[PDB]
Design an enzyme around this catalytic site. Structure first.
Site, mmCIF file in Angstrom:
data_model
loop_
_atom_site.group_PDB
_atom_site.id
_atom_site.type_symbol
_atom_site.label_atom_id
_atom_site.label_comp_id
_atom_site.label_asym_id
_atom_site.label_seq_id
_atom_site.Cartn_x
_atom_site.Cartn_y
_atom_site.Cartn_z
ATOM 1 N N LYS A 170 0.839 -1.177 0.000
ATOM 2 C CA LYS A 170 0.000 0.000 0.000
ATOM 3 C C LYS A 170 0.888 1.245 0.000
ATOM 4 C CE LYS A 170 -1.239 2.564 3.149
ATOM 5 N NZ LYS A 170 -0.889 3.673 2.246
ATOM 6 N N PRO A 171 1.140 1.812 -1.190
ATOM 7 C CA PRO A 171 1.910 3.068 -1.232
ATOM 8 C C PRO A 171 1.079 4.196 -0.625
ATOM 9 C CG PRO A 171 0.952 2.604 -3.379
ATOM 10 C CD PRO A 171 0.737 1.352 -2.533
ATOM 11 N N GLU A 243 10.894 1.605 9.934
ATOM 12 C CA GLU A 243 11.927 2.635 9.769
ATOM 13 C C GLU A 243 11.247 3.981 9.772
ATOM 14 O OE1 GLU A 243 15.067 2.240 10.314
ATOM 15 O OE2 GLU A 243 14.964 0.016 10.134
ATOM 16 N N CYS A 280 15.341 10.257 5.060
ATOM 17 C CA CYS A 280 15.424 9.975 6.477
ATOM 18 C C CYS A 280 16.833 10.274 6.932
ATOM 19 C CB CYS A 280 15.067 8.509 6.749
ATOM 20 S SG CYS A 280 15.981 7.314 5.645
ATOM 21 N N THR A 281 17.780 10.131 6.016
ATOM 22 C CA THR A 281 19.194 10.371 6.319
ATOM 23 C C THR A 281 19.712 11.670 5.655
ATOM 24 O OG1 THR A 281 19.707 8.986 4.447
ATOM 25 C CG2 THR A 281 19.784 7.908 6.609
ATOM 26 N N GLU A 374 12.444 16.911 13.265
ATOM 27 C CA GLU A 374 12.906 16.545 11.924
ATOM 28 C C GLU A 374 12.293 17.492 10.899
ATOM 29 O OE1 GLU A 374 13.036 12.579 8.979
ATOM 30 O OE2 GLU A 374 11.333 12.702 10.420
ATOM 31 N N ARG A 436 25.062 4.943 1.641
ATOM 32 C CA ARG A 436 25.097 3.516 1.912
ATOM 33 C C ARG A 436 25.121 2.817 0.583
ATOM 34 N NH1 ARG A 436 19.126 1.001 2.446
ATOM 35 N NH2 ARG A 436 17.786 2.818 1.926
HETATM 36 C C1 LIG Z 1 15.020 7.123 4.088
HETATM 37 O O1 LIG Z 1 15.110 7.997 3.178
HETATM 38 C C2 LIG Z 1 14.537 5.737 3.673
HETATM 39 O O2 LIG Z 1 14.220 4.813 4.738
HETATM 40 C C3 LIG Z 1 15.723 5.126 2.996
HETATM 41 O O3 LIG Z 1 16.827 6.022 3.146
HETATM 42 P P1 LIG Z 1 17.494 6.416 1.741
HETATM 43 O O4 LIG Z 1 18.929 5.904 1.798
HETATM 44 O O5 LIG Z 1 17.141 7.900 1.743
HETATM 45 O O6 LIG Z 1 16.671 5.524 0.803
#
Ligand SMILES: *C(=O)[C@H](O)COP(=O)(O)O
Ligand SMILES: NC(=O)c1ccc[n+]([C@@H]2O[C@H](COP(=O)([O-])OP(=O)(O)OC[C@H]3O[C@@H](n4cnc5c(N)ncnc54)[C@H](O)[C@@H]3O)[C@@H](O)[C@H]2O)c1
Ligand SMILES: NC(=O)c1ccc[n+]([C@@H]2O[C@H](COP(=O)([O-])OP(=O)(O)OC[C@H]3O[C@@H](n4cnc5c(N)ncnc54)[C@H](O)[C@@H]3O)[C@@H](O)[C@H]2O)c1
Ligand SMILES: *C(=O)[C@H](O)COP(=O)(O)O
Lengths: 473, 473
Positions: A170-171, A243, A280-281, A374, A436
């Site tokens: 579900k987007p 998350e 998120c990061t 945030e 990452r």
């Molecule tokens: C947060 O943006 C999401 O959970 C995944 O982080 P990204 O590295 O921005 O995809």
């Protein structure tokens, strides 16, 4: 106008959810106002189907999906930009990430992480071996957020496919069309349609079913803290991978040369503005030690001013809009509020609807809302911190969040002190917190996550049950 | 009369919980009726203390604890037997298992399972390395059941110590004294007392605090389904490792010779009656294929009749009592009910209070309460199943549980068909379902567990957070 995809069938309702382009607030699409019964049907199909794909067949589907993503990247990124409002530069980049997700998941299919234990180990020992293997779940529930309409779906669906799971997605109602498109590509790439459904609707109608359906063994959710906590309360006795947000620092230490401060300023600007700061990061706090701040800030200002912000469909735009006007307004408010508390706005060409410029603010108070909460937009906020690592670390750890971080320094001793002392899931030396690879362990602690890792490899383990068997030996 | 152990301090209350010996229902001990505030204090102490033990120091404590368990095994098993009612033979055996748990946890302290990732993997690649390490949680909450008053506490505490965690244990009010004794041994062995508290009381007073205390990062529970579900519903946004019951089969296939049926009979009787049948993985359903049942059953009967059941403190007793008279009566009822439904009671020397003999019942209906529900006593119930593996597997999988299983056959093809088809965490070929080593992955699915593995190695991973860090390379 796009119907739900329920195990490969197009399924419509009378009522519609309108999808608006945040650039000019026009309706660019519509999807069904699905209800509990739709999710319910998708989960029953998921539960009843038992995938039998070999690892080779899974790899072939996943790699074909990667090829389709690459071949159709322009089309896919158009859909992303039109729904989310991020620049084509950002959306094209997002397709590249999804291409990596599917490629890496396809390549991990050949890997068997089974273990063998000998049992003649203690006075209670026996001549016997124990072996492990993995098996898929009944059904997986995936709920995704607006900031990566493609890649968030990829991260939840690719590992499911690679492990012979059936997933229902579900987007968010804000950006559902990308997901529906991804589903079509997967069917076309040869996925047995029972392995994937994408349902849409208002949270009030269909959201609870995604959380409580009795066939659901696992809920994987990415989104906000409040929605995350609600999910955790309502999905009892289901595995949950939650998350939630971040509020991540890029830390500038006082040992850097002027050339290095410049490289750090590059990271600060990119980290704070990529994807319109909707990560998120994302860099949401630039903690600059006092003694280099006077040389650092100007370097940051200069780079921010180079950024072209505007029409997301213009291929020369760097920075598109945020998700909507209300979010943009809230972020600008937090800036103004911080300035009244002492902050120094150095660059703010003015907001236009959902279009926020890369506002540079210096001397931000660490407890002001702009950085304590945030702020999910392309603000570049520099907090001046002491020339003391212990004080800097304490400050960095002082929010409710703990996801990622970036530290710029050349002093190994200080590097390892930050690596050990920051309360986060990830510490990147000389990179943004956002850095990452798609397959490394990813996840936060505190309010950033319920404590389980994600990324392609950990997701694949997470989407399975380990079964052991032992044999006389 | 024993006080709580709160970070090494003896802590008493006015009100008492009486501990009775199930053999004669006399009071053998008393512990405090602890309240929320006691748990609260233990958790505050746990959260505030940051363990700094080296791996060497942890190993030394754990191995010293093992040596103490061995040296005091008679004393410790007396306490177990007086509290639970199991025979000295079973309680001595339980000490041996706890000895293995501490030994294996001690030896695992030298092991670092960190990983390294190279980042130059895709077009988005960087000359960089990612490394992983583990860190402890703020505090762990451990809630333990009556059936292994020593070993269940060992399995939750040993891995905590090994990973520099601080743990607070609330044993069941039915068998708390063994836990209190284990705490003294650990303090004596050199454990920093802040790393361990053992609190006691009625679930109504202190149980909720163990689930909802804000410092608790993880709740690890072993016990019944209803209590397990309640904990899952109340512990929101905490990691939870819940092991609930089993209802596990020993399956006898029709390829076995008469010599093999005898060996299988030995497994059936041991598996059904060890620990007075009070194991989540006890043999609770012996599924014997029809064509060998006439030869198998008599061999079972003959072995059951050899068991000496009676005074648990008599060193020649095999089978002691169950936890109490009410449980014993319930199990006997289920046997009678099953006989009214067609079952054939072959051996039943008569119950005496909490002392249940190893009743042998043949032709048990699979949907009778005796085998459909979990019967936590030393009943030896043979369900006759078709000479058809598909039907046998379907039958085996038909309960709400899925923990472990045993299969006796020499036909490899059938072995692997059962291994793949039984819906359980473990399939043992030619062993009881209860067979494992103390460090192999252990856990069920369905109602048997919430889907996370236990055992020393998986517990240690579970009790930590993985942090990643990357360096320019
Ligand atoms: C947060 O943006 C999401 O959970 C995944 O982080 P990204 O590295 O921005 O995809
Ligand atoms: O805004 P954002 O997308 O970034 O983050 P968010 O926290 O608001 O929501 C992320 C996702 O959760 C969904 N959601 C919202 N309310 C829900 C509910 N009550 N139950 C189940 N799912 C729900 C959203 O539709 C979206 O898919
Ligand atoms: O019988 P069994 O020992 O096998 O399993 P059980 O579920 O009945 O009890 C196992 C453990 O859970 C505890 N418990 C029981 N009720 C609780 C509650 N309402 N809240 C928190 N903890 C609770 C028990 O005291 C015991 O320590
Ligand atoms: C069940 O008893 C508990 O979860 C552990 O099982 P054992 O194999 O009896 O220790």
């Amino acid at each position: 106008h796009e119907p739900m995809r329920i195990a490969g069938r197009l399924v419509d309702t009378d009522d519609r959810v309108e999808v608006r382009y945040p650039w000019n607030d026009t309706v660019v699409g519509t999807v069904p106002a699905g209800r509990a019964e739709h999710a319910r049907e998708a989960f029953a199909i998921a539960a009843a189907y038992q995938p039998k794909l070999t690892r080779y067949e899974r790899q072939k589907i996943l790699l074909a999906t990667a090829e389709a993503l690459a071949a159709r990247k322009e089309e896919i990124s158009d859909v992303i930009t039109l729904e989310l409002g991020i620049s084509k530069a950002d959306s094209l980049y997002e397709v590249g990430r999804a291409f990596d997700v599917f490629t890496l998941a396809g390549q991990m299919c050949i890997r068997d992480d089974g273990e063998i234990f000998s049992c003649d180990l203690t006075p209670h020992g026996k001549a016997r071996k124990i072996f492990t293997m993995r098996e898929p779940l009944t059904a997986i529930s995936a709920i995704t957020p607006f900031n990566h309409p493609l890649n968030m779906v990829a991260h939840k669906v690719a590992p499911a496919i690679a492990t012979n799971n059936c997933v229902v997605v579900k987007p968010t109602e804000l950006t559902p069309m990308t997901a529906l498109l991804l589903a079509d590509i997967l069917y076309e790439a040869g996925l047995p349609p029972e392995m994937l459904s994408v349902v849409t609707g208002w949270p009030a109608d269909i959201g609870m079913e995604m959380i409580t359906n009795p066939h659901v063994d696992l809920v994987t959710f990415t989104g906000s803290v409040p929605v995350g906590k609600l999910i955790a309360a309502n999905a009892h006795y289901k595995r949950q991978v939650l998350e939630l947000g971040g509020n991540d620092p890029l830390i500038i230490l006082n040992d850097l040369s002027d050339d290095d401060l410049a490289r750090a300023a590059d990271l600060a600007v990119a980290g704070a503005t990529k994807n319109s700061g909707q990560r998120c990061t994302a860099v949401k706090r630039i903690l600059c030690q006092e003694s280099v701040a006077d040389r650092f800030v100007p370097l940051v200002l200069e780079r921010a001013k180079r950024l072209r912000f505007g029409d997301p469909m213009d291929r020369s735009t760097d920075l598109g809009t945020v998700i909507h006007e209300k979010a943009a307004a809230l972020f600008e408010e937090r800036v103004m509020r911080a300035a009244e508390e002492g902050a120094d706005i150095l660059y703010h060409p003015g907001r236009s609807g959902a279009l926020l410029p890369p506002i540079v603010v210096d001397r931000v108070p660490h407890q002001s809302d702009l950085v304590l909460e945030e702020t999910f937009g392309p603000i570049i906020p520099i907090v001046r911190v002491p020339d003391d690592d212990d004080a800097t670390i304490t400050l960095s750890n002082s929010t409710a969040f703990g996801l990622s971080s970036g530290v710029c320094t050349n002093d190994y001793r200080r590097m390892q002190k930050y690596i050990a002392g920051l309360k986060v899931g990830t510490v990147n030396i000389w990179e943004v917190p956002g850095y990452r690879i798609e397959m490394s362990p990813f996840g936060g602690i505190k309010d950033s996550g319920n404590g389980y890792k994600e990324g392609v490899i950990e997701a694949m383990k997470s989407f399975t049950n380990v079964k052991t068997f032992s044999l006389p030996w």
